[PDB]
Amino acid sequence: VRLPGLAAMRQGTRLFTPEQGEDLREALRRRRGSFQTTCEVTSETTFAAARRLREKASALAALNFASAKNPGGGFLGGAQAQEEDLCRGSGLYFSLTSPQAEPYYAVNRQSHSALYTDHLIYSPQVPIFRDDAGQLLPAPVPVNIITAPAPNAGAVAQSRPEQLPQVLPTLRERARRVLGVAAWMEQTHLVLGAWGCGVFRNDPAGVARTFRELLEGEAQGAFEHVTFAVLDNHPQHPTLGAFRRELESLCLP
Ligand SMILES: Nc1ncnc2c1ncn2[C@@H]1O[C@H](COP(=O)(O)OP(=O)(O)OC[C@H]2O[C@H](O)[C@H](O)[C@@H]2O)[C@@H](O)[C@H]1O
């Protein structure tokens, strides 16, 4: 049988096209300053942090460090990707494959460009069925998921180095659209993290700086709470450390 929650989530899945960029900037603008935003950096998975936020989050959203060209990443390379962790534990794949999200994949593929495009998919009330360990949750917990691909900085470096000056501007403006989806959908709690910093090989300090700059500027006080849940099993914890250091000025009471 189709799992509970899936049908309603798929039918409510929505595409944000690049032409919505100003609508997202306006939504951020209208919401800036609403709260004293609290921030934190944790070493949790995206869904551990979401499940810990749920009970006291009015509208909870999380970022999917998405593939531009295949729902769920096509399930290639293994279980170190965040997006495959999301599709393993939740109904997200059933949303990403929806007919209305298909332009995101078709256009990004048609771009023949490792910066990808400014399409974003919004997936309402995605049910989380399992925890990090794969055990069945007694009750699925719903989360709203924003799907956006960071620029593929590894592929720029190796395949089209004349786009190298475009990686950070791309990352910066698309991070702006992610927050703008969240503000347009009037989300209070956001689970962010090291978007683009593994398979896509973006620089962790650069990505956390870009989220810092936005949460101190255009998106300042637009959200109740922001969690940078940064899973990092590398020996020196360089990703988690880069986020912790770069986001120490924001994560203050
Ligand atoms: N469940 C997790 N939760 C939180 N953080 C995680 C998790 N898993 C990894 N991280 C950390 O977050 C960092 C980034 O996670 P990555 O998945 O590489 O994001 P990208 O945007 O650079 O690659 C996206 C591509 O890879 C996928 O296949 C997509 O389909 C795309 O094709 C990791 O280094 C971890 O430290």
Consecutive H or E run containing 160: none
Alpha carbon of residue 180 to chain centroid:
12
Alpha carbon of residue 219 to chain centroid:
16
Rounded to the nearest angstrom, the distance between the alpha carbon of 33 and the centre of ligand 1 is: 30
Q: Calculate the alpha carbon distances from 145 to 42, 112, 168, 191, 246 in Å.
A: 19, 26, 23, 9, 25
In sequence order, the β-bridge partners of residue 130 are: 136
**Closest Cα to atom 5 of ligand 1:** 231
Q: How many CB atoms lie within 10 A of CB 19?
A: 8
Q: Calculate the alpha carbon distances from 199 to 87, 135, 222 in Å.
A: 17, 26, 30
Rounded to the nearest angstrom, the distance between the alpha carbon of 200 and the centre of ligand 1 is: 8
Resolution in A: 2.0
Among residues 46, 43, 233, 18, which one has the least CA distance to residue 104?
18
In sequence order, the β-bridge partners of residue 14 are: 122
Q: Are 219 and 185 in contact (CB under 8 A)?
A: no
Q: Are 200 and 207 in contact (CB under 8 A)?
A: no
Pocket of ligand 1 (CB under 6 A): 45-46, 65, 67, 73, 81-83, 85, 150, 193-200, 229-232, 239
**Domain architecture of the chain: domains with CATH:** 1-253 (3.40.220.10)
- Radius of gyration, CA atoms only, the chain: 17
* Those residues with Cβ within 8 angstroms of residue 63's Cβ, 6 or more apart along the chain or in another chain: 46, 145, 146, 148, 178, 190, 191, 192, 193, 195
Among residues 109, 34, 50, which one has the least CA distance to residue 85?
50
State the SS3 of 55-114.
HHCCCEEEEEECCCCCHHHHCCCCCCCHHHHHHHHECHHHHHCCHHHHHHHHHHHHCCCC
Q: Calculate the alpha carbon distances from 154 to 80, 167, 198, 249, 253 in Å.
A: 17, 10, 9, 29, 37
Among residues 176, 175, 180, 213, which one has the least CA distance to residue 194?
175
* Those residues with Cβ within 8 angstroms of residue 90's Cβ, 6 or more apart along the chain or in another chain: 47, 126, 127, 128, 129, 143, 145
